[PDB]
Amino acid sequence: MPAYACQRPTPLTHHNTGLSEALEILAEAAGFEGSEGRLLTFCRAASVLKALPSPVTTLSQLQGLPHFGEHSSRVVQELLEHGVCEEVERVRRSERYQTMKLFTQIFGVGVKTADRWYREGLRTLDDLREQPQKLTQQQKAGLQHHQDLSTPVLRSDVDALQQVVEEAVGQALPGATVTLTGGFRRGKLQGHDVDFLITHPKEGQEAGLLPRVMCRLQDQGLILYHQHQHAFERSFCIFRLPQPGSWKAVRVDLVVAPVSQFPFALLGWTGSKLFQRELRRFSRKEKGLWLNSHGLFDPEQKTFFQAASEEDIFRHLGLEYLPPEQRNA
Ligand SMILES: Nc1nc2c([nH]c(=O)n2[C@H]2C[C@H](O)[C@@H](COP(=O)(O)OP(=O)(O)OP(=O)(O)O)O2)c(=O)[nH]1
Ligand SMILES: [Mn+2]
Numbered sequence: 072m073p074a075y076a077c078q079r080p081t082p083l084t085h086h087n088t089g090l091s092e093a094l095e096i097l098a099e100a101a102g103f104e105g106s107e108g109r110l111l112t113f114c115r116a117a118s119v120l121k122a123l124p125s126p127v128t129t130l131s132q133l134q135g136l137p138h139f140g141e142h143s144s145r146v147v148q149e150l151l152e153h154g155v156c157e158e159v160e161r162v163r164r165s166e167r168y169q170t171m172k173l174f175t176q177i178f179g180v181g182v183k184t185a186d187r188w189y190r191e192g193l194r195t196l197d198d199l200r201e202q203p204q205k206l207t208q209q210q211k212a213g214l215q216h217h218q219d220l221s222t223p224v225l226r227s228d229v230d231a232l233q234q235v236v237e238e239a240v241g242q243a244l245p246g247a248t249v250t251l252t253g254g255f256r257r258g259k260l261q262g263h264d265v266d267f268l269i270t271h272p273k274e275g276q277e278a279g280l281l282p283r284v285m286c287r288l289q290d291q292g293l294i295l296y297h298q299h300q301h302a303f304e305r306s307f308c309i310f311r312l313p314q315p316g317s318w319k320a321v322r323v324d325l326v327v328a329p330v331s332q333f334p335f336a337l338l339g340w341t342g343s344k345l346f347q348r349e350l351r352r353f354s355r356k357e358k359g360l361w362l363n364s365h366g367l368f369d370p371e372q373k374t375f376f377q378a379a380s381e382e383d384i385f386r387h388l389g390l391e392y393l394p395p396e397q398r399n400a
């Protein structure tokens with residue numbers, strides 16, 4: 072099995088959900104303690120299990136797989152032998168993990184903020200609301216809509232949001248396109264948000280598109296929050312999704328890319344996070360090129376690769392093309 076997640080297909084549905092879940096809990100906890108290497112190691116190990124053709128029912132199947140150190144093996148062994156791992160259940164039961172999970176999953180809260188808050192004695196969502204001076208407006212919006220934002224976004228939500236986003240961008244700029252990116256492009260049936268990458272075939276026509284799109288969405292009562300970040304023109308939003316009788320808040324990321332950058336932006340925003348990380352490490356270490364969401368830079372030559380498609384980027388990196396549904400690392 073190749074070393075980099077970008078060299079191997081990782082389908083949406085795989086055979087070792089319980090095992091990788093457990094290693095991802097440890098990665099996540101390692102992340103919560105600012106232990107980046109450990110996170111990456113647990114994350115790489117988890118994606119190895121996702122890439123396996125068969126369910127791992129005996130530890131004998133774990134013998135001789137890459138990035139798969141003694142710690143990850145031990146976790147898998149305990150799960151196979153006793154149906155549970157004590158280190159995993161300890162993390163799962165710990166107030167520290169539970170709280171960090173609680174805080175970091177709130178819109179606009181990363182690890183640093185969550186940790187700070189933890190250290191200052193905050194534990195619950197109601198604690199945060201008793202301290203509104205401590206919250207950005209984004210985080211306040213995240214808290215106001217936390218229940219809805221903890222509700223998985225379904226494919227049918229995505230279709231409805233794509234329609235309104237397409238309407239608003241078509242109305243704002245004819246010819247402008249909307250591409251579903253993120254997990255839903257990779258085949259996921261649920262998600263934490265919907266990611267859209269917006270562009271226009273004529274370079275430069277996308278200029279000031281986002282605010283036009285935003286005004287239109289806003290004018291229809293569809294926007295609960297947005298924050299224009301002007302890096303790509305982007306807005307990480309909360310939409311008011313109408314539903315039969317009800318409505319629900321849904322996280323939407325709108326990203327505008329100029330068409331020359333669109334392939335890179337698509338590749339980057341499609342993920343998975345680990346897949347992209349793996350692809351960027353691969354590009355750096357194995358090919359001496361710096362990949363990001365804007366381009367593929369050669370630092371020796373000081374050049375940028377021109378791509379018309381994601382296929383071009385893969386081809387240029389010496390990798391077999393992986394469609395999005397096989398990037399679920
Ligand atoms: N270049 C760039 N990429 C980003 C940013 N934020 C961000 O999520 N991405 C990328 C990382 C991943 O490769 C991809 C997926 O993002 P995501 O957080 O919505 O996660 P996801 O769609 O895979 O899964 P889900 O949890 O939404 O279902 O988008 C950013 O600020 N800049
Ligand atoms: Mn997403």
Ligand SMILES: [Mn+2]
Nearest residue numbers: 253264266324
């Ligand atoms: Mn997103």
